[PDB]
Design a protein around this ligand. Structure first.
Ligand SMILES: [Zn+2]
Ligand SMILES: [Zn+2]
Lengths: 185, 185
């Protein structure tokens, strides 16, 4: 049984994170929200205070099968400024685990730190212009090795369904859930 | 400037509620999350604890332009079992404000109490079969007077954008936000 870490820094885009999480948890994939903060309390971009399942320092050693990095302007900036987040991503990336940025995160967290490593990715807006060492691809979801990036909130179901199918290695459960919620997949 | 109340009972479907809240707040529509009993912290269907902006008990004479009723199996059962919820919805309904159920909530909250008033509505699954006095329509989003219903999570963007457009009395800013997040609408 697979486990996924969704990192929640101050200002995380709650919609991107919550839908992805909702989808993973419908499939009974183990998901842990991790506050990239002192405490489990973290407030999203649109002002929703939530309680993470754990903080990131409580799970610094743990090795997840995927790491989800939501966007939000301040969220992805706060992720990028946090040394523990950079280490957690870099260690998962070097272990071949799935690194899953959505919207601004691929550019602000990975790209800005030269962690894209020449890989194809998508991100939101024109943030790609300022990223020198990745291949921006304009698609809803982009998969390159263990990097799975999602373009923006409008494509979160595609992103989450792609992640899920890849984790499970079997589409059939994923399609069943997609049909349960009336999303074509 | 318009005001929307999102009711949050224990077990509320977080993805339904959070996407709607995100869309509304992107359009600078005022949103207040309201918990329904004695607590501001509320735990969603997929186990995310969130702090509501306020409670129903603090809003008994407040009159919102819309009331969102999220689904979730326990969420909608807990809304339906709560007389403060029934009073809040009935009052808004009688003042012509928008009543906006999604997924199970039209059947479980309005239909299970005979409050559909013969109106056209949609809900998830086959729950409409036990609903004695509404008219079930199988569409993503159904509108009939001040009742705007959403079929399920797969159609939440359509539900949220439609609600927003109705609140704003103008599609243009809505379509523009849908474009900004890459959702075809
Ligand atoms: Zn959910
Ligand atoms: Zn948001």
């Amino acid at each position: 049984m697979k486990k996924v870490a969704v990192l929640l820094a101050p200002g995380f885009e709650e919609a991107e994170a919550i839908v992805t999480l909702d989808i993973l948890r419908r499939l009974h994939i183990d998901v842990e929200t991790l506050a990239c903060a002192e405490s489990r309390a973290v407030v999203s971009y649109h002002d929703i205070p939530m309680v993470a399942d754990s903080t990131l320092s409580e799970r610094q050693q743990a090795l997840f099968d995927a790491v989800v990095l939501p966007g939000g302007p301040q969220g992805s900036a706060n992720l990028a400024a946090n040394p523990a987040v950079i280490a957690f991503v870099a260690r998962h990336d070097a272990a071949g685990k799935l690194i899953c940025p959505i919207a601004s995160a691929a550019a602000r967290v990975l790209g800005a730190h030269g962690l894209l490593k020449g890989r194809r990715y998508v991100c939101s807006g024109d943030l790609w212009k300022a990223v020198p060492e990745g291949v921006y691809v304009d698609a809803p979801v982009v998969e390159d090795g263990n990097l799975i990036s999602g373009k923006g909130l409008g494509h979160v179901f595609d992103f989450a369904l792609t992640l899920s199918a890849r984790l499970l290695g079997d589409d059939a459960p994923v399609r069943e859930q997609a049909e349960h919620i009336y999303y074509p997949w």
